[PDB]
Amino acid sequence: QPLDFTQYAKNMRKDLSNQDICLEDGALNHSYFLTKKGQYWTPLNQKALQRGIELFGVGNWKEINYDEFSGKANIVELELRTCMILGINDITEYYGKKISEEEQEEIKKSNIAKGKKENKLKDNIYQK
Amino acid sequence: TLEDIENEKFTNLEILTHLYNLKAEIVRRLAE
Amino acid sequence: EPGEDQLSLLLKWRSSYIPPQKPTNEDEYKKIICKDISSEKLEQHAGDVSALFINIKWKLSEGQSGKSIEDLKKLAISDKLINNGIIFIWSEKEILSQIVDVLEAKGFNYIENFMINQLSADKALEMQRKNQNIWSDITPEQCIEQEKFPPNNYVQDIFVNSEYSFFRKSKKILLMLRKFNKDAQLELRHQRTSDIFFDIFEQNKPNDVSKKGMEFVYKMIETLLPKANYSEENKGAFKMMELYADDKSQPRKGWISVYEQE
Amino acid sequence: KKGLQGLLQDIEKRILHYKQLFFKEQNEIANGKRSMVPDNSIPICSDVTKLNFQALIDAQMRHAGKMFDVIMMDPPWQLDSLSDEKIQNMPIQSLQQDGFIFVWAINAKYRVTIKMIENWGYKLVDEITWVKKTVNGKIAKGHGFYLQHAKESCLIGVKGDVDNGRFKKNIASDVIFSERRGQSQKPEEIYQYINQLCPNGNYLEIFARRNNLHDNWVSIGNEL
Numbered sequence: 275q276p277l278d279f280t281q282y283a284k285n286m287r288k289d290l291s292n293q294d295i296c297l298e299d300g301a302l303n304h305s306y307f308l309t310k311k312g313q314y315w316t317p318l319n320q321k322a323l324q325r326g327i328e329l330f331g332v333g334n335w336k337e338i339n340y341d342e343f344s345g346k347a348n349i350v351e352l353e354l355r356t357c358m359i360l361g362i363n364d365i366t367e368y369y370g371k372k373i374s375e376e377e378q379e380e381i382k383k384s385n386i387a388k389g390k391k392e393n394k395l396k397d398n399i400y401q402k
Numbered sequence: 403t404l405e406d407i408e409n410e411k412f413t414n415l416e417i418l419t420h421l422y423n424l425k426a427e428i429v430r431r432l433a434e
Numbered sequence: 435e436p437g438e439d440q441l442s443l444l445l446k447w448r449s450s451y452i453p454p455q456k457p458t459n460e461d462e463y464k465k466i467i468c469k470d471i472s473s474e475k476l477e478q479h480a481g482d483v484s485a486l487f488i489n490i491k492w493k494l495s496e497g498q499s500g501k502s503i504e505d506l507k508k509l510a511i512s513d514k515l516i517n518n519g520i521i522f523i524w525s526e527k528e529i530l531s532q533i534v535d536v537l538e539a540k541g542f543n544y545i546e547n548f549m550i551n552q553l554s555a556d557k558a559l560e561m562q563r564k565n566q567n568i569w570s571d572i573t574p575e576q577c578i579e580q581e582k583f584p585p586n587n588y589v590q591d592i593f594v595n596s597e598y599s600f601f602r603k604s605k606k607i608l609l610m611l612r613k614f615n616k617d618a619q620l621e622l623r624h625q626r627t628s629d630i631f632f633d634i635f636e637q638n639k640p641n642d643v644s645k646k647g648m649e650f651v652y653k654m655i656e657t658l659l660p661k662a663n664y665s666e667e668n669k670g671a672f673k674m675m676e677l678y679a680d681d682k683s684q685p686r687k688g689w690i691s692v693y694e695q696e
Numbered sequence: 697k698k699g700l701q702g703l704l705q706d707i708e709k710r711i712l713h714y715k716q717l718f719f720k721e722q723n724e725i726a727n728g729k730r731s732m733v734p735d736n737s738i739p740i741c742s743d744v745t746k747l748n749f750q751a752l753i754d755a756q757m758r759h760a761g762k763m764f765d766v767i768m769m770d771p772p773w774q775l776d777s778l779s780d781e782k783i784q785n786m787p788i789q790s791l792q793q794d795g796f797i798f799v800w801a802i803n804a805k806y807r808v809t810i811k812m813i814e815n816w817g818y819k820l821v822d823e824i825t826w827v828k829k830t831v832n833g834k835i836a837k838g839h840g841f842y843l844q845h846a847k848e849s850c851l852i853g854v855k856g857d858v859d860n861g862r863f864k865k866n867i868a869s870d871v872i873f874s875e876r877r878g879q880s881q882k883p884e885e886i887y888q889y890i891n892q893l894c895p896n897g898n899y900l901e902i903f904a905r906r907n908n909l910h911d912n913w914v915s916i917g918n919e920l
């Protein structure tokens with residue numbers, strides 16, 4: 275009998291493909307192929323960045339790169355991702371602070387709402 | 403020089419790294 | 435517009451390659467009639483050639499006219515015939531490995547490929563009938579002869595696609611193999627022609643190259659090896675040889691011609 | 697000096713524009729947006745000299761109950777080129793019991809490719825040639841030692857009983873008259889011809905790029 279190639283492909287991706295290529299159960303990770311090789315920003319990298327803000331200061335991403343990500347992480351991209359995970363285009367008022375996880379989500383929601391009521395919410399960041 | 407940045411084949415992240423490196427060198431000359 | 439379509443525009447070499455006439459003088463050519471080429475000792479009739487074109491026709495279907503890899507095995511090629519030269523042999527689909535095995539057995543080595551992308555003079559006519567329905571009432575033979583071609587802008591529908599047990603046969607491969615020599619040096623002219631050229635054929639006879647295509651091959655050989663060409667010093671020392679030659683287009687200036695049971 | 701200060705204002709504007717572009721791209725990525733890669737493609741990113749083919753054989757025998765039917769190959773010929781003998785050291789014999797192989801050979805590595813696929817247990821039956829094309833529809837260009845190189849060939853070896861189903865006879869064509877693109881990219885007409893030869897079926901392809909991914913193919917590569 276003929277077989278369905280969707281389930282076969284999911285099963286093959288489960289045990290053969292890397293964790294960066296396949297998602298959850300068996301689905302394909304499209305963000306991996308929407309980005310050139312070597313710059314994917316894995317969820318492990320995102321959690322490492324969140325732990326870096328949790329532990330050390332914000333805006334001091336030199337020791338963060340040195341002893342938190344791999345010893346080799348893309349500066350400027352770290353600033354971009356920290357901008358994206360606060361809902362604000364700039365980190366000028368957050369330099370030198372050590373924002374916790376709950377405060378991070380609270381300030382992200384506050385920035386999103388503040389850009390919402392003043393009409394600055396352009397791809398969930400606030401321009402100032 | 404903006405010509406290296408001006409290339410279309412580059413992505414938005416390497417372009418932005420180039421812009422920041424240009425800022426670093428020209429702010430070094432501004433300090434000079 | 436005339437003279438801008440793909441068929442009319444990949445086939446101007448035909449206009450630029452008119453064939454010449456036969457050589458009247460005996461001192462220009464050398465014609466040998468033999469009963470069995472594979473059983474022949476060609477050294478008694480030739481020596482130190484640099485271009486050995488073999489116009490061999492294969493059968494590869496048991497019940498068909500042609501030669502075989504056994505016949506190529508029986509053929510004798512020695513150092514006194516070729517010490518520094520290039521052999522040109524018509525290749526096929528199934529027996530390419532056997533050809534290269536038997537020829538690298540005799541000191542030769544594969545160097546280059548030169549093929550003819552086949553086109554159909556009848557499929558273009560039938561495409562003109564399909565796309566038109568008072569000039570396309572002719573024979574494909576007359577279409578080849580008078581160089582009157584139908585306008586096509588997508589040639590990958592008139593390719594000669596002969597029957598096969600696999601991907602349909604659509605090209606004629608000429609294998610070129612060079613017997614290197616450490617002492618002597620072969621003089622060559624590099625990149626004077628392309629390794630691929632289109633040429634019109636017929637559906638019933640796809641392995642019979644036209645006069646202009648055969649002359650294109652001959653001028654490719656002659657331009658590749660200029661010192662083998664006819665000159666005042668090559669009288670009786672012709673450096674180009676033929677095997678399984680035919681009366682159709684062979685006898686040329688400076689070519690040794692060996693026939694098969696005339 | 698104020699010319700570089702005007703350049704600084706312009707570079708601030710360029711940074712703001714590219715900041716917005718990056719944020720838009722990463723917001724659309726973290727949303728409903730798929731790449732050009734088909735959802736049924738199976739990519740494996742591993743070095744072939746370090747890849748364990750036993751796991752691949754076990755997975756294919758488990759999740760399909762069969763073996764591969766077509767193995768396409770574009771080897772990194774040494775003339776990131778790997779080697780000439782390391783390609784021969786591949787465990788191709790275990791990866792197929794009945795099917796075809798497609799090895800794209802350059803002019804300098806033609807006879808060694810033929811010897812390689814004859815040593816793997818295959819029999820030469822056909823070759824597929826790619827004639828390059830221009831925008832206007834010419835034969836593009838070439839350079840070589842004897843002739844101008846305007847072609848590229850793929851060598852096909854056969855194995856087992858291909859006449860016992862899963863394959864079609866007298867299809868497609870040997871010549872692909874298609875325009876060149878990229879740097880070493882091959883046309884998709886070879887994939888169309890493969891699908892014509894083997895409708896449905898299981899495929900493996902050992903040296904692949906991110907443009908080599910298709911909705912029925914297992915693709916191996918160093919960056920893919």
Ligand SMILES: C[S@@+](CC[C@H](N)C(=O)[O-])C[C@H]1O[C@@H](n2cnc3c(N)ncnc32)[C@H](O)[C@@H]1O
Pocket residue numbers: 742743744745770771772773776777778880881882902903904905908916917918919920
């Ligand atoms: C040999 S060419 C193949 C390109 C392909 N034909 C295309 O359509 O572009 C370059 C490819 O070889 C891959 N490659 C080179 N060495 C490799 C190796 N040892 N193992 C796996 N892939 C390798 C590269 O990563 C790249 O994908």
